[PDB]
C-alpha cells in the first residue's frame, strides 16, 4: 500500500525536548514527541519519542493530566498509542498569524475545563506544537494575561526560562505585548 510520511520537522533536532514545569502554574511545554517511523532518520542521542516524554515528566517528580496538542503537518504520534492514558485534546494551530480568536478561545476553555475538574491534585497540562516554542509559547502566555492577569513580558520571560529557549516569533511577542484581551 501507500508510503506514510516521515520527515523530521525542520529544526526539530535543536530544540530541548521537555522544558521545566512553570512554577506557579499547571504548565508544561515540549516538542512534539515522535513515534517509532521517524526513528530510523534519527541518532540514538536525537530520538524523543512519547515513551521519552512521559519518562522526563516523570523524571522531574510531575505527572500530566491533560496533553493539548496544536500540530497539524503530519501524524507525529497516535493518541491511542500514549503508553499512559492520559487525556488529550487536539487544537489544531495553523499557519504563522498571530492565533486566531477562535483558537484562543478554545485553548482557554480546555486549560479552565482541566483545573475546573482536578482543583483536587497537581497534574499539569502539556501543551506541545512542532517545537513547543512559539505556537505553544504564544497560547500559554495569552492565557497567562488574559485570565490570570500576568505583565505580558513577565508570562513570555516565564515561559523562555522554563522552556529552555526563547520565544521566537516577533509577531507574537507583539501582539502579546500590545494586542487586546480576548474575551473569557
Ligand atoms: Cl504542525
Known sequence: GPLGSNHIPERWK???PVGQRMPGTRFIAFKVPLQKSFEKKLAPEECFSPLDLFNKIREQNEEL???????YTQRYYKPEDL????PYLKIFTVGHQVPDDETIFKFKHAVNGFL???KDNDKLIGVHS??????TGYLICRYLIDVEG?????AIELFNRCRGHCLERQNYIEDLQNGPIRKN
Do not use: A, F, S
Open 14 to 16: 535543536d530544540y530541548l
Open 65 to 71: 493530566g491533560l496533553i493539548i496538542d496544536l500540530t
Open 83 to 86: 503508553p499512559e492514558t492520559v
Open 116 to 118: 475546573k475538574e482536578n
Open 130 to 135: 512542532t517545537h513547543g516554542l512559539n505556537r
Open 150 to 154: 500576568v505583565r505580558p513580558d513577565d
